[PDB]
Amino acid sequence: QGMRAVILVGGFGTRLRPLTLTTPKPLVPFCNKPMIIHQIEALKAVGVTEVILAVAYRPEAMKEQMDEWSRKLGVSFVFSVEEEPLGTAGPLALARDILMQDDKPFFVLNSDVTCTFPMQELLDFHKAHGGEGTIMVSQVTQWEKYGVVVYSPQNYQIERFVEKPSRFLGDRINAGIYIFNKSILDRIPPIEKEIFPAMAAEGQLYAFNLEGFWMDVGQPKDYILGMTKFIPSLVHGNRETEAVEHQRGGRFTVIGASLIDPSAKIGDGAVIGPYASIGANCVIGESCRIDNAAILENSKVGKGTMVSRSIVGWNNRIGSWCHIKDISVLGDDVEVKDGVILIGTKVLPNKDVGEHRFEPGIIM
Template structure:
C-alpha cells in the first residue's frame, strides 16, 4: 500500500491551478450556493511526529482526514466551493483533496501563502473569491471561515440562520468551558452581541470562548490587508466596538485536536457523539466495549478486548489477545499478540511487536518498528525508526 507521501508524488506541485467541481442539486430553501475558507496554513508542529508525514488537516480523525468532517458538514448547508488557505506541504493537500472533491461534489481551490499571514491575512489573500459569485460578479452572500483543527457537531444551518437574523457583519461560534481563566473569554449580551474580549480573566466575566468557526459578510474584507494579521486580536475587537460582531453558543462537544492529548480526547468526544447520533457506524459484538469505530478492512485476532474510545483504520492488523483502549490506530498499522495499547496514536505502517505496552499519550510516527516486549511511556517516536528497548521517560522524543 502506498504511503500518503508516495501518493502525493504523483501530483503536480502547482496547486494553484488545481480545482475540482461538479454540479449537484442543493436544498431548495437556500437562496444561493455558498463559499467557505478553511485555514490550513499551520506547520502542525504540535501534532508531530504525524505531521512529519502529512499535513495536519489530512491526518485521519475517526478514519477520514480531519478536514473532511468539516467539508461534509459544509456541504449539508449548501456550500459548494471551498478555499483552502495553505502554506505547508501543498502538494500533499492537493493529492488528498483530489479524491475527496469528487466524492463530495465540491469545488476546492487553493490560496497559497508565500509567508504565514496569521488568522486574518488569508481572508484578504482570498478576497477576490470570497466576495464574488461563480460568475465573478460582486456578492453580498455571507461565507464561512473555519480553523481546520476544530471538531464539533458543526451546526451550520442554525449558525447561518442566526447570522442572517441579526443582520450584522460577523458571527462567532462560541463554546462553554469549565475553566475560562485559561482562555480568551467572549463577553456578550443576552442577544449574543459581543461587548468585549477578556484574555485569561482572573475574575469571572463569563465562560464562553472562541470555537474557531465564523460567518462573515464580504464587507469584513475591507478591514484586512494581505499581511500577517490576527483576526482575534486585531479585527474582532474593532468589529465588536462598532456593534458588528455577534456570538452563538455551540450545543454539544467541541475540541481543538491540534495536539496528541487533545486528538485522543477529541476522538473520545466524537465517538460518544456518534454513539447517539449514528450508532450504526460503530462496531458491536463480543470483545468490543463501545464506542469503537473499525474500518471493514481491518483484521482483528481472537480473544481481543477493544474499547472504549478506539478507532481502527484501513488495513490494520491486530493479533490475538490484544487489549486496546483510548487509542487511534492509523491505516496499515499492526499490533502483535498480547500487546496492551492505551492512550496512543499508532502511525501508518507502524508495527508493535508481541507483548508490547504503550501508555500516557504515546505517539508513534509512520513506519516505526517496535520489537517484542517493549514498553513505551508517553514518548513521541519519529518516522522510520526501529525501537528495540523500552522507553520509560515520559515525554521523550526519539529522533
C-alpha cells in the first residue's frame, strides 16, 4: 500500500569506461556516496517504500549482494526488471505487471540526474491534476544547441513538443524526473517517448520549473563539472574562516568548500583545493594539492603531488612527487612511480605507470 517508484538505470556505462569496469555504472561513487544513493535518500525524504530498478543487461552483476544499503534505510530493492530487447519503455514492458495495489503516483527517475531534488512533488501540483508533475523542466542558456524544447506557457500545462525549434519558445528542458498516476499504465507494444505526444493531446501534462542546477553525469568532464556545481548546494545537508574541514591530521588549509571523509588522514601541510572529495581511509601526504578532484576509497598519496581536475581509482596507490592534471581517470588498483606527469590519460585497471604522458591517450 506504500508509495513506490521506478528508476531507469538500463545501460552499459560505456561513456564512463575507465572506472566502470570494476563496479557497475549506477554504483560508482559521487562525492561520498554511490550515484544512486542520493536518489534513494531523496525518495525517502518523500517517504517512498521500495524502488524498482530497471537494468537493461546483467541484472545479477554482483549488485544484489553489493547493495548493503538495502538492509539499512528500510528500503527494499526487488530487481524485478529483466529486459528482453524491446523499445525504450521500462515501466510499460516489465514494471506494468508489478504494481502491488498502489494508491499514489509513482516517481520515475534517470540514473544520471543531480539536482537539489525538490521532494514536495507528491504534494505539489495536487490542485485537481490528472497525472501530477508529468514532466520537470529547468533553464538552459543554449536553447537551440541541446534541442527538445518543452514550451511552458503562462498556464502550467504543455501542449507541444518541438525538436530544434527556430522560435524562442522557451528555455525549459526536460529534466528527466517524472511522476505518473497508476491509470497512465497502458499496454503499448514496441512507444513514442512513452506516449508523451498523446499525453499532451488530452492536455493533462504539467511542467515544474526548477531553479536549481541540472546536468547529465555521463562523462568524466561532466562528472567534474557536476561536482563543482553540487558541492556548494550541500552546505545545509551534511557535516562538511573556511571551516568545511580544517584540522583532521594536521594544520592544513582549504581554499574552498570540500568533502573530507572523517576517517581520512590529510597530513600536515596539504592544501585541499576548491570542490574536492576524499573517501574513507584515504591517506594524503605531508604537502599535497587536491584541486577540484575526487579521491575514492582507500588511496595513498605521497608528498608534493598535485591532483587537478582528475579522479583516482578505488585502491589506487599514487607516487610521491607526481603531477596528475586535466581530465584523467585512473582505474582500480593502479600505481604510479615517483615524478610522473599524467595529463589527461585514462589508465586501465591493475596497470602500472612509469613514464610521462604529455598528450591525451589511453594506457592499457
